[PDB]
Amino acid sequence: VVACFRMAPLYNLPRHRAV
Amino acid sequence: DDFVAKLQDNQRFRYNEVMQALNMSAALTARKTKEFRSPPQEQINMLLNFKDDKSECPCPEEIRDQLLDFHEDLMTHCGIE
């Protein structure tokens, strides 16, 4: 269930997209 | 720039904590990683619930404080206050 739980973390995104 | 960096660091640390503690339960880990499996826009709309007192946001009090200070500085600069 680990892969299903891990879908799209915000911390993995680049800084500008998160900004 | 720095607010989102602190938020990202905390969201990574909390994910590390939940991955360490996932062995405790099966369905409680489910809500806990609901946040991490949510789409990024929903994640950040959830993390930006510092206002009022609903408290469903899991972001810590200090990170709440920098945003609450910047917001009142911006309101003072806009003249609303």
Swiss-Prot record, chain A:
Q: What induces it?
A: By TGFB1.
Q: Where in the cell is it found?
A: Sarcoplasmic reticulum membrane
User: What is this protein's tissue specificity according to the annotation?
Assistant: Detected in heart muscle (at protein level). Heart muscle, brain (cerebellum and hippocampus) and placenta.
Q: How is it modified after translation?
A: Channel activity is modulated by phosphorylation. Phosphorylation is increased in failing heart, leading to calcium leaks and increased cytoplasmic Ca(2+) levels.
- What do we know about how this protein assembles, alone or with others? Homotetramer. Can also form heterotetramers with RYR1 and RYR3. Interacts with FKBP1A and FKBP1B; these interactions may stabilize the channel in its closed state and prevent Ca(2+) leaks. Interacts with CALM and S100A1; these interactions regulate channel activity. Identified in a complex composed of RYR2, FKBP1B, PKA catalytic subunit, PRKAR2A, AKAP6, and the protein phosphatases PP2A and PP1. Interacts directly with FKBP1B, PKA, PP1 and PP2A. Interacts with SELENON. In cardiac muscles, identified in a complex, composed of FSD2, CMYA5 and RYR2.
Q: What does this protein do?
A: Cytosolic calcium-activated calcium channel that mediates the release of Ca(2+) from the sarcoplasmic reticulum into the cytosol and thereby plays a key role in triggering cardiac muscle contraction. Aberrant channel activation can lead to cardiac arrhythmia. In cardiac myocytes, calcium release is triggered by increased Ca(2+) cytosolic levels due to activation of the L-type calcium channel CACNA1C. The calcium channel activity is modulated by formation of heterotetramers with RYR3. Required for cellular calcium ion homeostasis. Required for embryonic heart development.
Q: What is known of its domains?
A: The calcium release channel activity resides in the C-terminal region while the remaining part of the protein resides in the cytoplasm.
What name does the UniProt record give this protein?
Ryanodine receptor 2
Q: Which organism is it from?
A: Homo sapiens (Human)
- Gene of this entry: RYR2
Shown segment, full-protein numbering:
3599 to 3617 of 4967
Curated annotation (Swiss-Prot), chain B:
What compartments host this protein? Sarcoplasmic reticulum membrane
Q: What induces it?
A: By TGFB1.
Q: How is it modified after translation?
A: Channel activity is modulated by phosphorylation. Phosphorylation is increased in failing heart, leading to calcium leaks and increased cytoplasmic Ca(2+) levels.
User: Superkingdom, according to UniProt?
Assistant: Eukaryota
The tissues in which it is expressed are: Detected in heart muscle (at protein level). Heart muscle, brain (cerebellum and hippocampus) and placenta.
**Implicated in which disease?**
Ventricular tachycardia, catecholaminergic polymorphic, 1, with or without atrial dysfunction and/or dilated cardiomyopathy: An arrhythmogenic disorder characterized by stress-induced, bidirectional ventricular tachycardia that may degenerate into cardiac arrest and cause sudden death. Patients present with recurrent syncope, seizures, or sudden death after physical activity or emotional stress. CPVT1 inheritance is autosomal dominant.
Please describe the quaternary structure of this protein.
Homotetramer. Can also form heterotetramers with RYR1 and RYR3. Interacts with FKBP1A and FKBP1B; these interactions may stabilize the channel in its closed state and prevent Ca(2+) leaks. Interacts with CALM and S100A1; these interactions regulate channel activity. Identified in a complex composed of RYR2, FKBP1B, PKA catalytic subunit, PRKAR2A, AKAP6, and the protein phosphatases PP2A and PP1. Interacts directly with FKBP1B, PKA, PP1 and PP2A. Interacts with SELENON. In cardiac muscles, identified in a complex, composed of FSD2, CMYA5 and RYR2.
Family stated for the protein in its record: Belongs to the ryanodine receptor (TC 1.A.3.1) family. RYR2 subfamily.
Comment, domains: The calcium release channel activity resides in the C-terminal region while the remaining part of the protein resides in the cytoplasm.
Summary of the function given for this chain in its UniProt record: Cytosolic calcium-activated calcium channel that mediates the release of Ca(2+) from the sarcoplasmic reticulum into the cytosol and thereby plays a key role in triggering cardiac muscle contraction. Aberrant channel activation can lead to cardiac arrhythmia. In cardiac myocytes, calcium release is triggered by increased Ca(2+) cytosolic levels due to activation of the L-type calcium channel CACNA1C. The calcium channel activity is modulated by formation of heterotetramers with RYR3. Required for cellular calcium ion homeostasis. Required for embryonic heart development.
The entry's protein name is Ryanodine receptor 2
Q: Which residues of the full protein are shown?
A: 1930 to 2010 of 4967
